[PDB]
Design a protein around this ligand. Structure first.
Ligand SMILES: Nc1nc2c(ncn2[C@@H]2O[C@H](COP(=O)(O)CP(=O)(O)OP(=O)(O)O)[C@@H](O)[C@H]2O)c(=O)[nH]1
Ligand SMILES: Nc1nc2c(ncn2[C@@H]2O[C@H](COP(=O)(O)OP(=O)(O)OP(=O)(O)O)[C@@H](O)[C@H]2O)c(=O)[nH]1
Ligand SMILES: Nc1nc2c(ncn2[C@@H]2O[C@H](COP(=O)(O)OP(=O)(O)OP(=O)(O)O)[C@@H](O)[C@H]2O)c(=O)[nH]1
Lengths: 248, 429, 31, 431, 431
């Protein structure tokens, strides 16, 4: 459960790597019995390194975004509860986008957070596409978890990208009418997994220049779920859907 | 002062060289007797790139004229500039090889080429800092393709640091005046890859195409095609002789163009090219003439540059330019046909300007493209040569001399590896 | 620092690891 | 005392110095003959006959550039034993300026410095002038400034390099000859300025209202900045901004010596009357991303330590008052770990007019030198653009055949990326 | 202090300011060269050279209108950095003013305001000038008034909009681009005056005894109103009618900021001697329905709160005496819930004469700004006129193809009908 702040993903060291198999003695049911079939196995399944699809110029925006998700769905999303990278919020962009240059080369099991990063990195060749990050504050029984998506905008219509543990928080096709009902698909996704919502974090639109040094603004607006009106969720977030066009 | 001895091999190279020095003797204001009658002293301060001095105010061009065919010496000896050249430099044999390559390289050329290197070493001794050797010849012929490559492999043995230029007029499939043109062409290129470090594969089809379409002359009577390749021959070395805002030597071009040591085959191009009396007065304007300079019609090699992405491009301007308007236009060209350039060479269009135009214009700009669509120039010849080599026709005129039969199968593989090497980057990234 | 050996033997080690961890995170809630 | 010599390398080095020393002759009344018809001694070691030899050495390996200066105007001003000149251009090549040809003419240049560094009682520092666009400007300067810091350890050395633009480009091998330069200019240099050449076209088109500026319209705007940086050494005011003072008033670490220059005002003669050019307007114009002298947006990054250098009819009352607007109630965020602000470099002498007719006269100026962390996006191009070329091993054989080992590019990129990681390191304080 | 800039937009907006700034130079002695041969600083930020620069931002997306100003007379008065100019005219298309082309040139107009709003110690407010007749006057202003309300929240912003006339018309999409702009000016604006274009012909026909008036005989009368509204900020008297302690004498509710202007006297030169132009007839002329600036009859509706803004040689004795006849002994019925009456804006400065020869000089003048509910009859002739066109869905495909959602007309008509219900809501007190 507590993800680490380690460095040197490929190749791995001899300190962070040895605690991957001690942590599974608590949450995974076997713990040490799987070490004879994972660490104690010379033979292993050879999953290759898939490449990012270099799109031809006769491929428009929504055909590319499925081909973007056709990369990240085959990226083997991680469940081990330990981060493999050096991803931070307060991080410069070229220190982060060049870390995404070490995502196609490394291609380790990744979590939901850097999928938002790689969703930005695999979308810089679409200047008509405007993106923005949205993080959720999900309420379990007394606890607060985070789920961050990447909301997109092409031809006026909305949509969102991202990865999670289940299918209902993944890629949304870019055909939604407004922005408020787009979050409602995530809100209906939280009703199935027995999740309550607390806050919706709106951020500034990420600038379309991959070689630049600025921090990514994730907290341009905060929408408290249980402590604000439902009409304000369809009006202030609708004006914020136009306010992202107001900066531009 | 960087120096370049200039070797007019062959006969067509001698035909374009008699119009090459006619450009330069006008460009420095040198009379046909050899004196100086120029007005501005900025053209006199550096003439030693292309000239010498006699014991007066009388200059003599650093030129070596080589042709097995005689009599065409007597054209330029009795032409408009017969009293300009050094008469000791006129080297010519007796017979004249009749469109043969083995004759002219093995048998006939070896009995003459030692007289040349006693002159090219005589001219290398009066030069302070030698830059390179230009030589202008016709590929596919007898002399300029068989004596020329013998002359290069003897020069590059003695000077492995000096640069080399080769303005080889390649053969064309539509305008061919020789039945053994696809034999002398494919034998020359194997001895042209390994020795020269930048050629200029001009063609004689696109020169005929320019004088009908672009220049719109009635009759291209060979005083134009031998002149139009002379303007883009002075245009490469117009920064060595004139103070520019941003100037480029021949070493600067060959360090900016070839990404690998085998890819030196450049299709040159010159602009502006008006009509004879219409566009030079009425229609054409002369800022941003790169739209003319990048067109498929205004090339020298008869190849379609849209059929293959450029590797590197050098545009040597000449006029009194304005370096924003040079470079802002140069970005707009690179962003327009952005699929027509190699990905892994970003910002490849080399600029270079000067301060003195040709006499009779205001601005002018050559263009030296190192395209990959030059593989279409070699896919025609290696189609025609492989057709005749099946029947093995016209082979006793080469195997009759001291040339083996396996030399052709070796020379075709050395060409087809080059077309395999040039196709290696058209599709990869 | 030799590569293609440590970065593929321990790369497929996690690939054999998360196959049960993917199944574990979807079996704790099926009620 | 307080002498300061300026060396010039490359085609960019002389063409700036042809118009840089054009400006100093107007800033001291010195004729083109060197014969003044007070204190010019920071730039002119005069002779007893009445002449004034400028303390500069022009270096180029190709003779076609200096012979313009050696024969046109200002041909009697310079000293003919100091215009060092090679024969081969070696151009667009780092190794041919650092190993092959530049190795030959170093012993004539470095000897000529010691024939000028032995006339200085107080030597403030060296002022190199080159471009990163290949040839001698990066090949020979990497050999020169490595050779100077051996013989002159405790001496400052400025660097007015012309960093290559992202889009506007001249050399094809332009990214290769800049990754090989920063391994030199990280160690041996000090406060290496890096102006760009595309960013002046975005200044000389809107701020200065002329169309299609030549290289004589950017090498005068680069001349005024080296004037007003060294305007403290030769005039009066409330300055105390000599080159050893503002050096460690600027750099926070030995690796963050890459500020950007910015001049203001640059308004043309037509709109010189339609705007009152007072000190609140002059500083507020000096912080625009459309007014910097490099292709970077400083709003994206954060300033570490600026250094304003005013000159002319200002007073420190409203200079310090107009600063507090820009200091506090703006969104140009400074870094957290230094709240002291920035140097103020008030000088008395107003800037002059070069008579070529480019920008009209004013009463105030500023050459702000911000050590922002927005230079990490200037190297973000060339860390990628060179790596895009080196992946296919293009153009390497023109360096590995000249003396350069093939592993040098794998060393230079490895160093220059760790610098960019180090530049983005000091941008954050709180967790 | 008390500076007040004025932005202009449209074919109407520059053509008014071409003749409005013609008037202010006469009201301060300013030459056409901007060089006065006291206190003008509410309209002129002067320079130290003796010049004067007007504080106005002439914008238009089409170049053919400002180039009349930029080439003829008054070409040296303005500043060339502020005459913002696009390339496409954005031909009568609100979506081409609010989404397509106006989005490109917003960041230059908004940048020029902060280069003028930072020279203002006391900023009274903004004075926009546009027409509701399509194009940039309605499309680009809706992208501008929405823009200024973010950066300048607590700041007044007047609006001298031209309303589309009922019968006289120029555009075909005049009713389309006026329902779309009132969704902007209902919220972001403040005291949006809406003069008409037909009603000034019926002043230039009978009150002014000229025939065939051009747009120069009609923009002089719209320049005199903006003169005597801002005659409190730059002259003396018994005023206290600055634009924030006057606009809270206007609005009873935040949605009723739509007064009408009315100027008096407008008597021609040949009729100037045959009438003693004194304050009894001068005040009674303002309430004639044949003397309003909008084609509407205020005898139909009821006034809420006027604002009589005098100027010239008056005294407050008979001002308060001539008011009481109009207040009580008349049938111009006020609304019941405000019995205090209206403001009084006595100023000392008499109005001047533009030398084009339109109206001779007088000694008194009014600009009464009545917040009557007779503007509801100026919208029922637009609510019906728009819905007659939208019922057949004509011309909608020139907006939905330009980046505008088709449901916005069903929102703008829904909004502006609820405003008309709200404007008629406060018309009755007792049952
Ligand atoms: N560019 C030009 N090429 C020419 C011209 N005249 C002929 N030729 C070209 O040159 C070719 C023939 O010239 P060559 O010098 O090769 C004939 P050869 O080598 O055998 O020497 P000689 O027999 O002494 O003439 C011919 O196929 C054409 O392609 C010309 O005027 N200009
Ligand atoms: N800003 C500016 N840059 C210049 C100027 N002149 C040349 N440059 C730059 O110089 C770069 C090319 O490098 P060079 O200065 O020619 O260095 P070099 O190769 O050693 O010089 P040569 O050997 O004589 O060719 C180009 O990228 C230009 O940007 C100038 O006048 N102003
Ligand atoms: N009162 C008045 N109205 C005018 C005058 N000139 C033009 N107009 C009005 O202004 C409108 C012209 O369009 P603009 O407001 O400038 O906006 P636009 O559609 O973009 O026009 P352009 O900028 O020229 O393309 C017309 O509907 C006229 O009614 C004038 O002099 N006085």
């Amino acid at each position: 459960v507590p993800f680490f702040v380690n460095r040197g993903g490929l190749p791995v060291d001899e300190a962070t790597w040895e605690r991957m198999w001690k942590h599974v003695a608590k949450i995974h049911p076997d713990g040490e019995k799987v070490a004879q079939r994972i660490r104690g196995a010379t033979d292993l399944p050879k999953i290759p390194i898939p490449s990012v699809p270099t799109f031809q110029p006769s491929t428009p925006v929504p055909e590319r975004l499925e081909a973007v998700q056709r990369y990240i769905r085959e990226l083997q999303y991680n469940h081990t509860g330990t981060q493999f990278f050096e991803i931070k919020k307060s991080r410069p962009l070229t220190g982060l986008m060049d870390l995404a240059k070490e995502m196609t080369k490394e291609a380790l099991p990744i979590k939901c957070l850097e999928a938002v990063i790689l969703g930005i990195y695999l979308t810089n060749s679409m200047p008509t596409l405007e993106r923005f990050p949205i993080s959720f504050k999900t309420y379990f029984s007394g606890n607060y978890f985070r789920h961050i998506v990447l909301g997109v905008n092409f031809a006026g219509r909305y949509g969102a990208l991202g990865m999670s543990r289940r299918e209902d928080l993944m890629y949304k096709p870019p055909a939604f009418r407004t922005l408020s009902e787009l979050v409602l698909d995530f809100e209906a996704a939280y009703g199935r997994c027995w999740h309550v919502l607390k806050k919706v974090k709106l951020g500034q639109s990420v600038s379309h220049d991959p070689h630049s040094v600025e921090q990514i603004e994730w907290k341009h607006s905060v929408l408290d779920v249980e402590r604000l009106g439902r009409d304000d969720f369809r009006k202030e977030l609708e004006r914020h859907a136009r306010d992202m066009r107001l900066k531009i | 002062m960087r120096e370049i001895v200039h070797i007019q091999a062959g006969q067509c190279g001698n035909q374009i060289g008699a119009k090459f020095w006619e450009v330069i003797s006008d460009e420095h204001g040198i009379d046909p007797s050899g004196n100086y009658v120029g007005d501005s002293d900025l053209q006199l301060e550096r003439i030693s790139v292309y000239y010498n001095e006699a014991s007066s105010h009388k200059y003599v061009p650093r030129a070596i004229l080589v042709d097995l065919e005689p009599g065409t010496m007597d054209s330029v000896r009795s032409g408009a500039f017969g009293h300009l050249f050094r008469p000791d430099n006129f080297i010519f044999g007796q017979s004249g090889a009749g469109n043969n390559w083995a004759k002219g390289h093995y048998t006939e050329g070896a009995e003459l080429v030692d007289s040349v290197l006693d002159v090219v070493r005589k001219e290398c001794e009066n030069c302070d800092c030698l830059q390179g050797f230009q030589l202008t010849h016709s590929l596919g012929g007898g002399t300029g393709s068989g004596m020329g490559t013998l002359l290069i492999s003897k020069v590059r043995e003695e000077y492995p640091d000096r640069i080399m230029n080769t303005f080889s007029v390649v053969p064309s499939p539509k305008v061919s005046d020789t039945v053994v043109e696809p034999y002398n062409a494919t034998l020359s290129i194997h001895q042209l890859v390994e020795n020269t470090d930048e050629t200029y594969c001009i063609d004689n089809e696109a020169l005929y195409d320019i004088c009908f379409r672009t220049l719109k002359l009635a009759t291209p009577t060979y005083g134009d095609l031998n002149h139009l390749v002379s303007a883009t021959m002075s245009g490469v070395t117009t920064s060595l002789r004139f103070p520019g805002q941003l100037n480029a030597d021949l070493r600067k071009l060959a360090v900016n163009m070839v990404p690998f040591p085998r890819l030196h085959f450049f299709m040159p191009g010159f602009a502006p090219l008006t009509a004879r009396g219409s566009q030079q007065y009425r229609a054409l304007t002369v800022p941003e003439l790169t739209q003319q300079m990048f067109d498929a019609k205004n090339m020298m090699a008869a190849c379609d540059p849209r059929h293959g992405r450029y590797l590197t491009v050098a545009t040597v301007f000449r006029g009194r330019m304005s370096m924003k308007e040079v470079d802002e236009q140069m970005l707009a060209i690179q962003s327009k046909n952005s699929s027509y350039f190699v990905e892994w060479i970003p910002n490849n269009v080399k600029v270079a300007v000067c301060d003195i135009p040709p006499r009779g214009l205001k601005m002018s700009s050559t263009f030296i493209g190192n395209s990959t669509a030059i593989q279409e120039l070699f896919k025609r010849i290696s189609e025609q040569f492989t057709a005749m080599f099946r029947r093995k026709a016209f082979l006793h005129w080469y195997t009759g001399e001291g040339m083996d039969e396996m030399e052709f199968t070796e020379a075709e593989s050395n060409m087809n590896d080059l077309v395999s090497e040039y196709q290696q980057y058209q599709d990869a990234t | 620092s030799a590569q293609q050996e440590l970065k593929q033997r321990q790369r497929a080690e996690i690939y054999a690891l998360n196959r049960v961890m993917t199944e574990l995170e979807q079996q704790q809630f099926d009620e | 005392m307080r002498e300061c010599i300026s060396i010039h390398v490359g085609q960019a080095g002389v063409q700036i110095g042809n118009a840089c020393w054009e400006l100093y002759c107007l800033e001291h009344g010195i004729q083109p003959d060197g014969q003044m018809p007070d204190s010019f001694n920071t730039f002119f070691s005069e002779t007893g006959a009445g002449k004034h030899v400028p303390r500069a050495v022009f270096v180029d390996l190709e003779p076609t550039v200096i012979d313009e200066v050696r024969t046109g105007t200002y041909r009697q001003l310079f000293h003919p034993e100091q215009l060092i000149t090679g024969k081969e251009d070696a151009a667009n090549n780092y190794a041919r300026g650092h190993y092959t040809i530049g190795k030959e003419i170093i012993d004539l240049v470095l000897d000529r410095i010691r024939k000028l560094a032995d006339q200085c009682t107080g030597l403030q520092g060296f002022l190199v002038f080159h471009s990163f666009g290949g040839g001698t400007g990066s090949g020979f300067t990497s050999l020169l400034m490595e050779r100077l810091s051996v013989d002159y350890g405790k001496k400052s050395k400025l660097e007015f390099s012309i960093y290559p633009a992202p889009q506007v480009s001249t050399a094809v091998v332009e990214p290769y000859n800049s990754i090989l330069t920063t391994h030199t200019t990280l160690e041996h240099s000090d406060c290496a300025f890096m102006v760009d050449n595309e960013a002046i076209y975005d200044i000389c088109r809107r701020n200065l209202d002329i169309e299609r500026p030549t290289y004589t319209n950017l090498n005068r705007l680069i001349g005024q900045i080296v004037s007003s940086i060294t305007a403290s050494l030769r005039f009066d005011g409330a300055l105390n901004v000599d080159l050893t003072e503002f050096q460690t008033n600027l750099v926070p670490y030995p690796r963050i010596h890459f500020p950007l220059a910015t001049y203001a005002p640059v308004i043309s003669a037509e709109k010189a009357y339609h705007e009152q050019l007072s000190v609140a307007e002059i500083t507020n114009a000096c912080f625009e991303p459309a007014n910097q002298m490099v292709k970077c947006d400083p709003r994206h990054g954060k300033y570490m330590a600026c250094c304003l250098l005013y000159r002319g009819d200002v007073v420190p009352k409203d200079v310090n008052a107009a600063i507090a607007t820009i200091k506090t109630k703006r969104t140009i965020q400074f870094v957290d770990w230094c709240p002291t602000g920035f140097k103020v470099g008030i000088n008395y002498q107003p800037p002059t007019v070069v008579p070529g007719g480019d920008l009209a006269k004013v009463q105030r100026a500023v050459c702000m030198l911000s050590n922002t962390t927005a230079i990490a996006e200037a190297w973000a191009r060339l860390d990628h653009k060179f790596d895009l070329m080196y992946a296919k091993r293009a153009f390497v054989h023109w360096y590995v055949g000249e003396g350069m080992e093939e592993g040098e590019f794998s060393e230079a990129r490895e160093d220059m990326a760790a610098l960019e990681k180090d530049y983005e390191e000091v941008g954050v304080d709180s967790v």
